[PDB]
Amino acid sequence: QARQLLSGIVQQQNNLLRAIEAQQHLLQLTVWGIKQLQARIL
Amino acid sequence: LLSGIVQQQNNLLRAIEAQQHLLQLTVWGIKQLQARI
C-alpha cells in the first residue's frame, strides 16, 4: 500500500529531475541565441 | 529513505529557483534587444 506510493514518488522525483535537466539544456540554447543577437547588434 | 525523498524535494526546489534566476536574466536580455531593435 504505502510501498506503492513510496515507489511512485521516487519515480516522480526522477521524472521532475530529468525535466529540469532538459529545461536547463533548453535554457542554455536560449542564452546562445541572446548572445548571438547581441553580437549582431554590436 | 523517507528523509532522502524530502531532501530530494529540496534539491529539486532549489534547482527550480536557480532556473528561475536564469529565466529572469534571459527575459531581461530579450527585453534590452527588443527595445533596441
Binding site: 529531475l17 535537466e21 542564452v31 | 532522502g4 534547482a15 534566476h21 536564469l22 536574466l25
Partner: peptide, 29 residues
C-alpha cells in the same frame, strides 16, 4: 551586459551543481 554575463555563468554553475547533487540523491533513494 558584463554583469548579465556574470550572473548567467554564476547561476549556470549553481544549477549544474544542484543537478549533480540530485543525480546522487536519486540513485541513493
Amino acid at each position: 551586459w558584463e554583469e548579465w554575463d556574470k550572473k548567467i555563468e554564476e547561476y549556470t554553475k549553481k544549477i549544474e551543481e544542484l543537478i549533480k547533487k540530485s543525480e546522487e540523491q536519486q540513485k541513493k533513494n
